Design a protein around this ligand. Structure first.
Ligand SMILES: CN(C)c1cccc(C(=O)NN)c1
Length: 330
């Protein structure tokens, strides 16, 4: 089997992407944030505290003839941005882009933190990291990908995120029309439960490539590119007036600037992030100070190849017995 679903930016800045997902019988379609940096499929639901729901579409398990309470199971998760959610668990039928999994754990939120409530466009998350990170207790549950894998034509999914435009998540096949040149594959460590890999270095604008190992994670659920302070300083030093602002919470730059590109290495290959991808707009409405899309990972403990980086590439998440990651230009 295979599946193919379009993923759409939630706003003009590409802060996140939503992908429609069918849950239950008859189908209830919710727009989920596909997150390669976590491993829980959770949804706003009929069980979510009413004051914490503001415009989201909810899953109502009592209206699904295939929903079954997973007795005794609870979940609770907190993300890198400080947000969180928790609740209980059903199994139900879940389909993405024509690919169907029966008996998928659908984690029903009883509580969500304010940032979830405040974002009406995201109805929940669909985790695509390794199932070892799944938070369901006392019996850990498998991701949608993990459940689907054996049925897939090839044990892979791909992320093709758009810049200010829709893109695609495919399951079970590599669309050879969706990228240019060849796909360069690189080793993955699953030790921390992430799609963790080592970039071979970077360049700023038309500058020379610096060969240096940068360990980080491919994380579709993180907006920005978070890299070591040395690398980030080298980037922003090429932008007149750019500075790190502790009050704002990162590098800012004059909105009048034209940003340089940023290149990262994948083996001997190179992925170029155009300068415009690194512009996250005014820090507050009407400001002439703009927020940068490349930020330091120093306060995080891990480097994160988030959407800013990933949307410059066609990315293969290879879930074969020894997982790997592939990157192509597009
Ligand atoms: C340390 N934490 C929780 C962490 C680290 C790195 C990534 C994430 C995540 O949720 N990504 N979508 C979370």
């Amino acid at each position: 089997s295979t599946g193919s679903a379009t993923t759409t930016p939630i706003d003009s800045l590409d802060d996140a992407y939503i992908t429609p997902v069918q849950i239950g019988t008859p189908a209830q379609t919710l727009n989920l944030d596909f997150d390669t940096g976590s491993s829980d499929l959770w949804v706003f639901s009929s069980e979510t505290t009413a004051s914490e729901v503001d415009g989201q579409t909810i899953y109502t398990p009592s209206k699904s003839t295939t929903a079954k309470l997973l007795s005794g199971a609870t979940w609770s998760i907190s993300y890198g941005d400080g947000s969180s959610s928790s609740g209980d668990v059903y199994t139900d039928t879940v389909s993405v882009g024509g690919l169907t999994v029966t008996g998928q754990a659908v984690e029903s939120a009883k509580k969500v933190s304010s940032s979830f409530t405040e974002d009406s466009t995201i109805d929940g998350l669909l985790g695509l990291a390794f199932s070892t990170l799944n938070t369901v207790s006392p019996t850990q549950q498998k991701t949608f990908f993990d459940n689907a894998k054996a049925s897939l034509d090839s044990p892979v999914f791909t992320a093709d995120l758009g810049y200010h435009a829709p893109g695609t998540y495919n399951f079970g096949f590599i669309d050879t029309t969706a990228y240019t040149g060849s796909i360069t594959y690189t080793a993955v460590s699953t030790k921390q439960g992430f799609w963790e890999w080592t970039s071979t270095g970077y360049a700023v604008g038309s500058g020379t490539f610096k060969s240096t190992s940068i360990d980080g994670i491919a994380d579709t659920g993180t907006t920005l590119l978070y890299l070591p302070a040395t690398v980030v300083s080298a980037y922003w030093a090429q932008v007149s007036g750019a500075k790190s602002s502790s009050s704002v919470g990162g590098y800012v730059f004059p909105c009048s600037a034209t940003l340089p590109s940023f290149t990262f290495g994948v083996g001997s290959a190179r992925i170029v992030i155009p300068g415009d991808y690194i512009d996250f707009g005014p820090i507050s409405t009407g400001s002439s100070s703009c927020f940068g899309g490349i930020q330091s990972s120093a306060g995080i403990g891990i480097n994160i190849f988030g959407d800013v980086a990933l949307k410059a590439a066609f990315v293969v998440f290879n879930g074969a017995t020894t997982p790997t990651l592939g990157f192509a230009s597009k």
